[PDB]
């Protein structure tokens, strides 16, 4: 059972470093044709870094000289090395096996958002939508910078009829968003309704209980 | 070095229709082009490897076929969690090019939007700011008006509305549109009204309540 894990993702100052991890399971990267793959928000796949078997490494133009890609072999983790970080950057990053001959990219790591900007970050404020047959309440992830925030409903249990819209940049800079949940009305008085959202930017974790009104 | 022209860049079809998707290359690749398949927020996923051999675990529905410039994926069948964008990518000179992509959407039948209201907090009052709410939820098609009425006066460039990505199971779009306005200028008007336009409404609905 392959699984990649990856870290390193988040907020960096245009001009800056980041590192990027991505731990292997099921099969030897020192072997194997290993490849950072990025994507843009709303765009296409943009391929970065192929690590070949014998030890070459080849880059795509727009990376070169500014990243390396390397692995180690004992840690069996893989890492990509940023440098000269600018807004064009920014983008999910994605370790995924390539296949010399004419094969595959059959395993991928479940991606890790970079962000390149210099704007400071903001912890969201959380309002509740209160709700007043079915039931519709939710959470209001209001002025956060930057994307993303996680949100989730009973500490990830009531994960059925979960509505979490993608967010809105507002003009003043900040991001916001809603995050809906449509549950049987006779539970309103036993079963209380929470919100958990986490910001891992600012590291801020709130955790808000929606209640009728 | 080839660069890859995908057809069409969108698709929206019914479940249970054949899907067919093209990828052109402006320069020969033999036989050297891959298949994948990307879901909102998720990693992409192989699909097809030198251009017709179908990859480990993908279903029977999915296949592929070429050689040369002209290349071809196909869904025999079409299913609701087939809703994704689909990638072409062509591995013979360096770089390593990928293809832009085609969109598949699921053409579902009408379905009419469920209105929510929803009244800024008072948490929320505290800050100075009024943020009003309103949701249309599960509806198809995605084309929906939304107006906004404050003592029945039209509102202008104090709204942002937000869709869901297709839902995989039953395909229709979720709408958010949260009008913002000052703490003062939400208590010197008393009725706030929603009013939403759709193909699945035989009238518009208005949605409101009082302050």
């Known amino acids: 059972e392959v699984q990649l894990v990856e870290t390193g993702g988040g907020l960096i100052q245009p001009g800056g470093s980041l590192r990027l991890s991505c731990a292997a399971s099921?099969?030897?990267?020192?072997?194997?044709?290993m490849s950072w793959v990025r994507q843009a928000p709303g765009k296409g796949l943009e391929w970065v870094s192929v690590?070949?078997?014998?030890?070459?490494?080849y880059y795509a133009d727009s990376v070169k000289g500014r990243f390396t890609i390397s692995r180690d072999n004992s840690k069996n983790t893989l890492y990509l090395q940023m440098n000269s970080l600018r807004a064009e950057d920014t983008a999910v990053y994605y370790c995924?096996?390539?296949?010399?001959?004419?094969?595959?990219?059959?395993?991928w790591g479940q991606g890790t958002l970079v962000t390149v900007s210099s704007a400071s970050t903001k912890g969201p404020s959380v309002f509740p939508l209160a709700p007043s047959g079915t039931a519709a309440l939710g959470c209001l992830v209001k002025d956060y910078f930057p994307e993303p925030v996680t949100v989730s409903w009973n500490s990830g249990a009531l994960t059925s009829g979960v509505h979490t819209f993608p967010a809105v940049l507002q003009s003043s800079g900040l991001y916001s968003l809603s995050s809906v949940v449509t549950v049987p009305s006779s539970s309103l008085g036993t079963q209380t309704y929470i919100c958990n959202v986490n910001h891992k930017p600012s590291n801020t974790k709130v955790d808000k209980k929606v209640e009728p009104k | 070095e080839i660069v890859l022209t995908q057809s069409p860049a969108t698709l929206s079809l019914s479940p249970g229709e054949r899907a067919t998707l093209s990828c052109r290359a402006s320069?020969?690749?033999?036989?050297?082009l891959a298949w994948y398949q990307q879901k909102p927020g998720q990693a992409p996923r192989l699909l097809i490897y030198?251009?017709?051999n179908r990859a480990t675990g993908i279903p029977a529905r999915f296949s592929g076929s070429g050689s040369g410039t002209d290349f071809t994926l196909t869904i025999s069948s079409l299913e609701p969690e087939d809703f994704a964008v689909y990638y072409c990518?062509?591995?013979?000179?360096?770089?390593?090019?990928f293809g832009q992509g085609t969109k598949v959407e699921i053409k579902r039948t009408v379905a009419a939007p469920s209105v929510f209201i929803f009244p800024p907090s008072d948490e929320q009052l505290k800050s100075g700011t009024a943020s009003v709410v309103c949701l249309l939820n599960n509806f198809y098609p995605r084309e929906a008006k939304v107006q906004w009425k404050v003592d029945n006066a039209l509102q202008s460039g104090n709204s942002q509305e937000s869709v869901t990505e297709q839902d995989s199971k039953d395909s229709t779009y979720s709408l958010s549109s949260t009008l913002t306005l000052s703490k003062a200028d939400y208590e010197k008007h008393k009725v706030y009204a929603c009013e939403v336009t759709h193909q699945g409404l035989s009238s518009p609905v208005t949605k409101s309540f009082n302050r």
């Open positions: 995924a096996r390539y296949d010399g001959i004419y094969g595959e990219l059959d395993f």
């Open positions: 099921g099969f030897t990267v020192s072997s194997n044709y």
């Open positions: 690590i070949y078997s014998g030890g070459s490494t």
């Open positions: 320069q020969s690749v033999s036989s050297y």
């Open positions: 030198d251009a017709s």
């Open positions: 990518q062509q591995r013979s000179n360096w770089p390593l090019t």
